[PDB]
Design a protein around this ligand. Structure first.
Ligand SMILES: [Cu+2]
Ligand SMILES: [Cu+2]
Lengths: 79, 79
């Protein structure tokens, strides 16, 4: 059941402005819920504040599209 | 498991240009696959050809977003 959800997560994150790919995604089931941790690429010339905004937008987009996700941490790396 | 998928189907169809709501949706599991039949509302002043285009765009959008769907029939009604 996980591969389909992971695809949806990647797809949803990569649609958000400022995301330069999903570098890392670890998702696991906690019962019927998904808990996930993600790293996104961002432009090295974005400010840290902008990167933080992009992370927050990813969290909103992904959580909004995939209802079973109950925890999602997003961080950023220069790419 | 079905309610989540039906939500995704409605949501995906209602995002397509020219769709004036999902009037009817019957979805059923055939094993792990979904087979569905849908009626969408359309502007009574669209041509039949335009309605046919909108139906085809709905089928593409829904099938593209929901991988488990293996059959989807879409028709249109004036609304
Ligand atoms: Cu903030
Ligand atoms: Cu045609």
């Amino acid at each position: 059941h996980m591969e389909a959800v992971q695809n949806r997560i990647v797809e949803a994150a990569e649609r958000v402005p400022g995301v330069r790919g999903v570098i890392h995604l670890r998702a696991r089931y906690v019962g019927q819920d998904i808990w996930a941790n993600m790293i996104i690429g961002v432009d090295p010339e974005n400010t840290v504040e902008q990167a933080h905004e992009i992370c927050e937008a990813v969290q909103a987009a992904v959580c909004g599209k995939i209802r079973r996700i109950e925890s999602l941490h997003v961080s950023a790396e220069a790419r």
